[PDB]
Amino acid sequence: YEDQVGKFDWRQQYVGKVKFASLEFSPGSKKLVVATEKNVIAALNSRTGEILWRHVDKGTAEGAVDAMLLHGQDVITVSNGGRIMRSWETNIGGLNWEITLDSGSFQALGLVGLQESVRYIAVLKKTTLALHHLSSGHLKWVEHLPESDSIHYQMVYSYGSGVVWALGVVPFSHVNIVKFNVEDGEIVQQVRVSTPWLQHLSGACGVVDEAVLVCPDPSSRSLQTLALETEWELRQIPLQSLDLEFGSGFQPRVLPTQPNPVDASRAQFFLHLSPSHYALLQYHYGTLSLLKNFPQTALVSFATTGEKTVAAVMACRNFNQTYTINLYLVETGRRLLDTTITFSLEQSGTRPERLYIQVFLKVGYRALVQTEDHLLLFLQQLAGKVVLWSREESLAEVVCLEMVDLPLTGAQAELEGEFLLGMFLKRLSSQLILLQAWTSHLNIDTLARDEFNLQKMMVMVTASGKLFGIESSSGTILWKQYLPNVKPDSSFKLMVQRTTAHFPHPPQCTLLVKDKESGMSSLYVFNPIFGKWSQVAPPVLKRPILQSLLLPVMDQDYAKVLLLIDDEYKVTAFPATRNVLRQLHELAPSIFFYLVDAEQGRLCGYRLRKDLTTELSWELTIPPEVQRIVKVKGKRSSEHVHSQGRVMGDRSVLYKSLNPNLLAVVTESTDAHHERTFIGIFLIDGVTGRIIHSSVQKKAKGPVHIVHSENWVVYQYWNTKARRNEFTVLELYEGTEQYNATAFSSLDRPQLPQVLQQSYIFPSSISAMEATITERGITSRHLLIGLPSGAILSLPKALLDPRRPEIPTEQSREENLIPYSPDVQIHAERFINYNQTVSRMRGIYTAPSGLESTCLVVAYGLDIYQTRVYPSKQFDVLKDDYDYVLISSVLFGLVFATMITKRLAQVKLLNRAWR
Amino acid sequence: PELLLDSNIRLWVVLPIVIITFFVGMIRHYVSILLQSDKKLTQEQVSDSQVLIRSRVLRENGKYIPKQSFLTRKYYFNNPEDGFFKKTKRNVTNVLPMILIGGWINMTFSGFVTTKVPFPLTLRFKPMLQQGIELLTLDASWVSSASWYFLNVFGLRSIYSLILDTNKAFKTEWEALELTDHQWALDDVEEELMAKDLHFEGM
Ligand SMILES: *[C@@H]1O[C@H](CO)[C@@H](O)[C@H](O)[C@H]1NC(C)=O
Ligand SMILES: *[C@@H]1O[C@H](CO)[C@@H](O)[C@H](O)[C@H]1NC(C)=O
Ligand SMILES: *[C@@H]1O[C@H](CO)[C@@H](O)[C@H](O)[C@H]1NC(C)=O
């Protein structure tokens, strides 16, 4: 369907947050390379954010990169804690060779060449040393670290010619140095020197000139230096001849350069003394000489063109997040007159924290910044457009989202304004206004909804503390916000509290954040349309929060109430006005909380009182040694169901049990072994605490996937006795009659319904699963399945029916119940995402339109997707094929035929008269 | 009234078929005018009909004239072998252009819904009022176009008006005229007239 193919769907794809990178290909053709936290490898185009090839491997921590290296046309990657090694091509994404190593820790990696070429690469894993070939991969040789149990061998070097050095330190006793040499494998003389002042040389020091080590001793405020080739009992230079004091509580470090592993490193280098104090120095055999010192520098990089060797430096200017970047020539210190970039960030607290350089030979330079939040920028040496492109990689980990309706037109606003004689005159006035408007007639600030709204502004919140706002059609970030001091692991809940239906009253949404270490909690309230904090200040939570509900009852300003529960079992009601409080003092005893802790495996249920307190009402446990709760589900409050009954074959009726306050609980065993594994299901009422149903499915362990809709339930699992996935489905029916058909108080039903169920098989694995939705519940409901390959599948619920003939009678035949479909099938004619695959697909969101024939779908994983679905073929839109020309060529035909056969019968009749 | 429908449907599929049927019900009338023929059959039959009608009116209102005259003509008509009757011896177009068009429509405007009827209907009649839809869950008030067409047809019938053998026949007349009473029926008019007064007040 070309239209949906190109009008309403789209797919952004991200890589995450850069750890490593490598620029400066041969001239730099068009491209750069990264290697992120999310285990990805990408080959971006350095004129515009766009991808050539991803090679995402493994979410979980057995593909996490530990080093990276570019040999000028290719790359080298060391994954899985030293074990695996790969090389790629950097052109098409085409691997050329992969191998695996022994068990170790990967202390370090290097790239060695013997006298004039670079044939070999070296690996150090705290026990041994390996040396492999470049193109083949097949190992050349391994040697063993002399003692390899206390030294903590932490550094390799090779100054080009000949041989190799390996360096380790015991914390506060000494360091040992060793030399190997290629094509022997043999341990040349090793040296030992005592130095009880360092505790590491990982991020402290590095080789500078042709063997030379230099490491700092903040005690004695000096630099302990060593030629490493023709000297021991290491020398020392006191850093008092130069007014070059260290910091108080710092670990000062060293930054050398080595643009060629065949020629030695350069005799100029950098020191990081204080947070914001950097120094450039130069090393002669004994004469250290300062060329420059920078007091207000956050970041600096080295770089090298064909021959020249340069240093980029970053600085703040005075404030308003405005930074400047400059180039310096390393040999002298002389700044280069031109090449001052000045740029600025848009957010309030946000720091660069990282800088990479690419360099031309016109001489030009382009900079890459991985700023704090996760954002990425590519800056060019221009004046007017300085940001060549910007890439917002924080969306690679989304947590929870929502879809909000847009604001109103003027027409609808004044229309609401329109609504004894005052009534009549009001109506007249508004009518005359619209009239004058009609006669007269014949982006963030000018957008509003359309008929049968499909635009449905999106609000997504992110694990790094960055809120967005998107359009949901050609998704364009319209606004952003950043809320600070957010750990990696927290817990969010996103509540909508007033929408765009009351013109003068502005919308608002609400956000609850946990901290996960102290239990503290924070409440941030805002307006999802423009991205702004609201004027009303939220109350200050003292205690760790546990849970919250939304309670659609309103206040005199059309706002829901958002009850929150403390840890000392006390309630807080956010819009705490007098009106709401009297409403509550009236209707409190029809409000119940349910809480669940998986640690000890216990459930509890409380209720309110006239005042805001809680009296324990029901309580329930589960033994945590044979059952471990996995997840808990409850019906979406924002659904409406059409039919209370299912017409039977012979014009009879089977009524269905809904129970809004129901909830499903899923458990799995502890004694995991594929003969005695089992999965447990419980169906509970939230109010009383009585189990409707309590089921067990044996020989099944796997990660489960569940859906609990209006009166049906579905769960997917994995059978270890035929090594295959499976589906299981439940339905609840009370009977043939209705019991208080108008009220459904859950304190009045003795009789428990009859469960039907069934179990099918499925040919593949699963990721996030969801169900469609639309208000009024009319149209058929589908199941959206996320396969591992990234494709999505729409499955009709009516295919999963426990009441299926199973060698039909004639009733089932009439009821057209399609007996017991074997091996529920998979054909690629119902895949939404034809070539728009989503990689990880941790989740799916489904939202309702206003047209009742469409659902709005959003798939979130490592890469977003968005589209519309049509379960029943769009019965309320005209045909999307209409011929408007035939119909305007017909009416005129008839009108002229009518005039014709009017003037053509009057005449024949008159002539009949005067024959 | 729970659904929200495209207004383009109103524009481009509803009014066309409250128009088409109107102009076709007009054209049917005008063409029927242009179609009908009229024979010039014969002098004999027309004369015979005329005299039969004279007989009819004789039997009907031959009671305002002298008796002897009525009996004289009755004799000139009944008298054996002189009596005149004893000497002389010798839908589809409607329905079809309405049923052929519903088919065209339901072949053209098929895959969607048109409108709602405000009175609840019976369920068994659903599968033929919608005819494109694959919900089998809606109430049947929500219809297709064809039903709107047929409703219009039946509703606009009444609103065009507002804007616009020989010998045996002879013998049967004779037999029905044999039994006949003159009943002169004028024999008190004098008194009745001069009973209250003369009435005229418009001079
Ligand atoms: C902050 O930076 C923006 C960047 O365009 C600039 O327009 C604005 O003037 C700056 N703020 C101040 C106070 O100068
Ligand atoms: C139905 O429930 C309502 C509310 O609980 C109650 O007022 C009514 O009496 C009940 N009627 C029946 C027949 O159960
Ligand atoms: C996706 O595949 C379809 C055909 O399978 C093709 O027409 C379309 O161009 C593809 N999209 C991309 C972005 O390659």
Nearest bound ligand to the CA of residue A738: 2
Number of residues that this document lists for chain B: 203
Torsion of Cα atoms, A897 then A902 then A905 then A910, to 10°: -150
CA of A184 to the centre of ligand 1 (A): 63
Q: Quick check: A887 contacting B, CB < 8 Å?
A: yes
A320 Cβ inside 6 Å of ligand 1: yes
Whether A875 contacts B113, CB under 8 Å: yes
Give the span between the Cα atoms of A854 and A869, in whole angstroms: 6
Q: Quick check: A648 contacting B, CB < 8 Å?
A: no
What token pair was written down for A179? Answer: 């030399």
Give the span between the Cα atoms of A554 and A550, in whole angstroms: 10
Q: Quick check: A850 contacting B, CB < 8 Å?
A: yes
Give the span between the Cα atoms of A337 and A341, in whole angstroms: 12
3-state secondary structure at position A581: helix
Q: Report how far apart, in Å, the C-alpha atoms of A282 and of each of A213, A265, A586, A840 are.
A: 13, 12, 81, 50
**Contact (CB<8Å) A879/B112:** yes
Which of B6, B36, B110, B144 has the highest number of chain A CBs within 10 A, making it the mutation to test binding with A? Answer: B6
Whether A34 contacts A54, CB under 8 Å: no
Give the span between the Cα atoms of A701 and A198, in whole angstroms: 51
Which atom, in ligand 2's list, is nearest to the CA of A745?
5
For chain B, breaks with the C atom over 2.5 A from the next N come after 90, 164
Which of A879, A884, A915 has the highest number of chain B CBs within 10 A, making it the mutation to test binding with B? Answer: A879
Interface of A with B in 16-55 (CB under 8 A): none
**Contact (CB<8Å) A642/B137:** yes
Of A884, A897, A905, the CB nearest to B33: A905
List Cβ neighbours of A24 (8 Å cut-off, separation of 6 or more): A70, A303, A304, A358, A359
Chain A positions in Cβ-Cβ contact with residue B26 (cut-off 8 Å): 898
A440 Cβ inside 6 Å of ligand 1: no
Nearest residue on chain A to B1, alpha-carbon basis: A776
CA of A323 to the centre of ligand 1 (A): 12
| Residue reference for tokens 């009516």 | A798
Nearest CA to ligand 2 atom 4: A743
**Backbone torsions φ then ψ of B98, nearest 5 degrees:** -95, -30
Whether A51 contacts A44, CB under 8 Å: yes
Resolution in A: 3.4
Nearest bound ligand to the CA of residue A9: 3
A280 strand-pairing partners: A270, A292
Give the span between the Cα atoms of A874 and A897, in whole angstroms: 37
**Backbone torsions φ then ψ of A828, nearest 5 degrees:** -80, 55
Q: Quick check: A723 contacting B, CB < 8 Å?
A: no
Whether A256 contacts A266, CB under 8 Å: yes
Give the span between the Cα atoms of A846 and A713, in whole angstroms: 18
Give the span between the Cα atoms of A425 and A422, in whole angstroms: 5
Give the span between the Cα atoms of A572 and A544, in whole angstroms: 12
Nearest bound ligand to the CA of residue A590: 2
> How many angstroms away from the CA of B53 is the closest CA of chain A?
25
Q: Report how far apart, in Å, the C-alpha atoms of A454 and of each of A9, A199, A347, A850, A857 are.
A: 12, 62, 31, 8, 11
**Contact (CB<8Å) A850/B4:** yes
Amino acid at B157: R
**Contact (CB<8Å) A778/B137:** yes
List Cβ neighbours of A411 (8 Å cut-off, separation of 6 or more): A434
Nearest residue on chain B to A898, alpha-carbon basis: B27
- Nearest CA to A489 out of A411, A425, A399 is that of A399
Residue A276 DSSP symbol = T
CA of A641 to the centre of ligand 2 (A): 21
A250 Cβ inside 6 Å of ligand 3: no
3-state secondary structure at position A100: strand
HSE value, Cβ hemisphere, 13 Å, CA-based, for A866: 22
Give the span between the Cα atoms of A258 and A112, in whole angstroms: 12
Continuous H helices in A451-494: none
Amino acid at B136: L
Give CB contacts under 8 A, 24+ apart, made by A882-891.
Answer: A882/B12, A884/B12, A887/B12, A887/B16, A890/B20, A891/B16, A891/B19, A891/B20
Q: What string of DSSP letters covers chain B?
A: ------HHHIIIIIHHHHHHHHHHHHHHHHHHHHH-------HHHHHHHHHHHHHHHHHHH--SS-HHHHHHHHHHHHSTTTSGGGT----HHHHHHHHHHHHHHHHHS-SS--EE-SS---STTGGGTSSS-----S-TTEE-HHHHHHHHHHHSGGGTGGG--HHHHHHHHHHHHHS-------TTHHHHHTSS-------
**Contact (CB<8Å) A878/B31:** no
Q: List ligand 2's pocket residues with C-beta within 6 A.
A: A 740, 742-743, 745
Q: Report how far apart, in Å, the C-alpha atoms of A293 and of each of A244, A289, A341 are.
A: 9, 11, 20
Of B27, B33, B135, the CB nearest to A872: B135
**Contact (CB<8Å) B23/A894:** yes
Give the span between the Cα atoms of A859 and A866, in whole angstroms: 6
- Nearest CA to A622 out of A665, A673, A567, A675 is that of A665
Of A776, A879, A905, the CB nearest to B34: A905
**Backbone torsions φ then ψ of B47, nearest 5 degrees:** -60, -45
List Cβ neighbours of A338 (8 Å cut-off, separation of 6 or more): none
- Nearest CA to A176 out of A161, A159, A157, A154 is that of A154
3-state secondary structure at position A775: coil
Give the span between the Cα atoms of B142 and B115, in whole angstroms: 6
Give the span between the Cα atoms of A97 and A138, in whole angstroms: 10
Consecutive H or E run containing A902: helix A891-903
Of A642, A780, A887, the CB nearest to B12: A887
**Contact (CB<8Å) A875/B132:** yes
Give the span between the Cα atoms of A368 and A68, in whole angstroms: 18
Nearest bound ligand to the CA of residue A835: 3
- Nearest CA to A197 out of A227, A149, A146, A234 is that of A234
3-state secondary structure at position A742: coil
Torsion of Cα atoms, A422 then A423 then A425 then A426, to 10°: 110
What token pair was written down for A569? Answer: 């079992």
Nearest CA to ligand 1 atom 14: A320
Continuous H helices in A617-738: none
Give the span between the Cα atoms of B146 and A593, in whole angstroms: 54
Whether B60 contacts B177, CB under 8 Å: no
Chain A positions in Cβ-Cβ contact with residue B10 (cut-off 8 Å): none
| Residue reference for tokens 């090839």 | A53
Residue A198 has a CB neighbour count (10 Å cut-off) of: 20
Give the span between the Cα atoms of B51 and B56, in whole angstroms: 9
**Contact (CB<8Å) B5/A876:** yes
HSE value, Cβ hemisphere, 13 Å, CA-based, for A512: 23
**Contact (CB<8Å) B13/A902:** no
* B interface residues, A as partner, C-beta within 8 Å: 2-9, 12-13, 16, 19-20, 23-24, 26-27, 30-31, 33-34, 111-113, 132-135, 137-138
Give the span between the Cα atoms of B151 and A360, in whole angstroms: 80
**Contact (CB<8Å) B6/A887:** no
> How many angstroms away from the CA of B3 is the closest CA of chain A?
7
**Backbone torsions φ then ψ of B69, nearest 5 degrees:** -70, -50
Of B5, B9, B134, the CB nearest to A872: B134
A237 strand-pairing partners: A223
Whether A840 contacts A848, CB under 8 Å: no
**Contact (CB<8Å) B9/A894:** no
CA of A614 to the centre of ligand 2 (A): 27
Whether A270 contacts A229, CB under 8 Å: no
Give CB contacts under 8 A, 24+ apart, made by A237-243.
Answer: A237/A286, A237/A288, A242/A288, A242/A290
What token pair was written down for A343? Answer: 């740029």
Number of residues that this document lists for chain A: 915
Nearest residue on chain B to A880, alpha-carbon basis: B111
Residue A887 DSSP symbol = H
Give the span between the Cα atoms of A590 and A603, in whole angstroms: 19
CA of A349 to the centre of ligand 1 (A): 15
Whether A504 contacts A414, CB under 8 Å: no
Give the span between the Cα atoms of A679 and A670, in whole angstroms: 10
Give CB contacts under 8 A, 24+ apart, made by A806-809.
Answer: none
**Contact (CB<8Å) A778/B132:** no
Give the span between the Cα atoms of A405 and A422, in whole angstroms: 33
Amino acid at A427: R
Give the span between the Cα atoms of A89 and A725, in whole angstroms: 38
Give the span between the Cα atoms of A892 and A889, in whole angstroms: 6
Nearest CA to ligand 2 atom 7: A743
Nearest bound ligand to the CA of residue A831: 3
Chain Cα centroid distance, residue A198 = 41
